[PDB]
Write a protein that holds these residues in place. Structure first.
Motif, PDB file in Angstrom:
ATOM      1  N   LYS A  84       0.886  -1.176   0.000  1.00  0.00           N
ATOM      2  CA  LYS A  84       0.000   0.000   0.000  1.00  0.00           C
ATOM      3  C   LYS A  84       0.913   1.213   0.000  1.00  0.00           C
ATOM      4  CE  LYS A  84      -3.590  -2.100   2.893  1.00  0.00           C
ATOM      5  NZ  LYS A  84      -4.290  -2.003   4.194  1.00  0.00           N
ATOM      6  N   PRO A  85       0.766   2.194  -0.895  1.00  0.00           N
ATOM      7  CA  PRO A  85       1.670   3.311  -0.895  1.00  0.00           C
ATOM      8  C   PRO A  85       1.432   4.282   0.253  1.00  0.00           C
ATOM      9  CG  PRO A  85      -0.114   3.686  -2.378  1.00  0.00           C
ATOM     10  CD  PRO A  85      -0.236   2.264  -1.922  1.00  0.00           C
ATOM     11  N   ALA A  86       2.436   5.091   0.566  1.00  0.00           N
ATOM     12  CA  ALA A  86       2.321   6.150   1.559  1.00  0.00           C
ATOM     13  C   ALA A  86       1.293   7.185   1.116  1.00  0.00           C
ATOM     14  CB  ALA A  86       3.674   6.822   1.771  1.00  0.00           C
ATOM     15  N   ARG A  87       0.458   7.646   2.057  1.00  0.00           N
ATOM     16  CA  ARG A  87      -0.719   8.521   1.753  1.00  0.00           C
ATOM     17  C   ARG A  87      -0.759   9.816   2.558  1.00  0.00           C
ATOM     18  NH1 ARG A  87      -5.051   7.703  -1.404  1.00  0.00           N
ATOM     19  NH2 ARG A  87      -5.187   9.961  -1.302  1.00  0.00           N
ATOM     20  N   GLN A  88      -1.452  10.810   1.997  1.00  0.00           N
ATOM     21  CA  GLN A  88      -1.406  12.220   2.344  1.00  0.00           C
ATOM     22  C   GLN A  88      -2.827  12.720   2.531  1.00  0.00           C
ATOM     23  OE1 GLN A  88       0.874  13.798  -1.068  1.00  0.00           O
ATOM     24  NE2 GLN A  88       2.818  13.584   0.024  1.00  0.00           N
ATOM     25  N   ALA A 138       3.879   3.968   4.178  1.00  0.00           N
ATOM     26  CA  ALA A 138       3.752   2.906   3.195  1.00  0.00           C
ATOM     27  C   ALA A 138       3.895   1.562   3.892  1.00  0.00           C
ATOM     28  CB  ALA A 138       4.808   3.050   2.107  1.00  0.00           C
ATOM     29  N   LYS A 139       2.937   0.667   3.649  1.00  0.00           N
ATOM     30  CA  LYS A 139       3.008  -0.704   4.134  1.00  0.00           C
ATOM     31  C   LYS A 139       3.512  -1.579   2.991  1.00  0.00           C
ATOM     32  CE  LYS A 139       0.161  -2.829   7.771  1.00  0.00           C
ATOM     33  NZ  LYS A 139      -0.248  -1.669   8.626  1.00  0.00           N
ATOM     34  N   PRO A 140       4.781  -1.986   2.985  1.00  0.00           N
ATOM     35  CA  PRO A 140       5.327  -2.700   1.822  1.00  0.00           C
ATOM     36  C   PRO A 140       4.704  -4.082   1.658  1.00  0.00           C
ATOM     37  CG  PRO A 140       6.889  -2.784   3.619  1.00  0.00           C
ATOM     38  CD  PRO A 140       5.746  -1.913   4.094  1.00  0.00           C
ATOM     39  N   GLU A 141       4.963  -4.680   0.494  1.00  0.00           N
ATOM     40  CA  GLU A 141       4.386  -5.980   0.189  1.00  0.00           C
ATOM     41  C   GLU A 141       5.041  -7.061   1.040  1.00  0.00           C
ATOM     42  OE1 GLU A 141       4.780  -7.904  -3.467  1.00  0.00           O
ATOM     43  OE2 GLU A 141       6.980  -7.886  -3.520  1.00  0.00           O
TER      44      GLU A 141
END
Lengths: 99, 99
Positions: A61-65, A79-82
């Motif tokens: 999941k990408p880092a979010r703003q 960001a929660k990596p795979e």
């Protein structure tokens, strides 16, 4: 009739099997570690009463703003990596458990 | 690495525990008949290594027509009647097995 705990299950097994509850718990711990060791080596396991242990891959999941709606202050999410996750699937005998 | 069969698991547990496989099998057989009997009394049960067994009422779903997203091949899905089902949920120890 409320839920049946693991520790009550051990007792119920021991009384029905006529075996030492401590030996019973030795068995499930051995199973528990075998399941664990296999999954770590990307090996799948089927256990009674018909459950299949899988290793699934989870998308990053990408880092979010964002912004606080009330105060307009910014909030951010890492960001929660795979990663690898564990899925269980009820197999044939578990579906037919009510038949 | 290939899937460990419900029967291959028994052999591994029998070796790790130094119990005979037939003794291993009697334990899980007893565990199955306890799960099966409790669910048929609408009673919930937790088994190692951390799976919860629930009976849910599943609604009727009508038949529908799907599509293979990469070829457009139609794939019909048959209608499910209102039935009771066995649902299993993975708890924390299982979701943490790769840690």
């Amino acid at each position: 009739k409320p839920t049946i705990t693991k520790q009550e299950l051990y007792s119920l097994v021991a009384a029905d099997t006529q075996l030492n509850k401590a030996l019973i718990e030795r068995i499930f711990t051995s199973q528990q570690k075998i399941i664990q060791n296999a999954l770590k080596h990307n090996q799948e396991v089927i256990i009674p009463p018909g459950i299949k242990f899988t290793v699934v891959t989870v998308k990053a999941k990408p880092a979010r703003q964002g912004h606080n709606p009330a105060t307009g202050e910014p909030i951010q999410i890492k960001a929660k990596p795979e990663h690898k996750a564990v899925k269980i699937r009820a197999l044939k005998p578990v579906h037919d458990m009510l038949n």
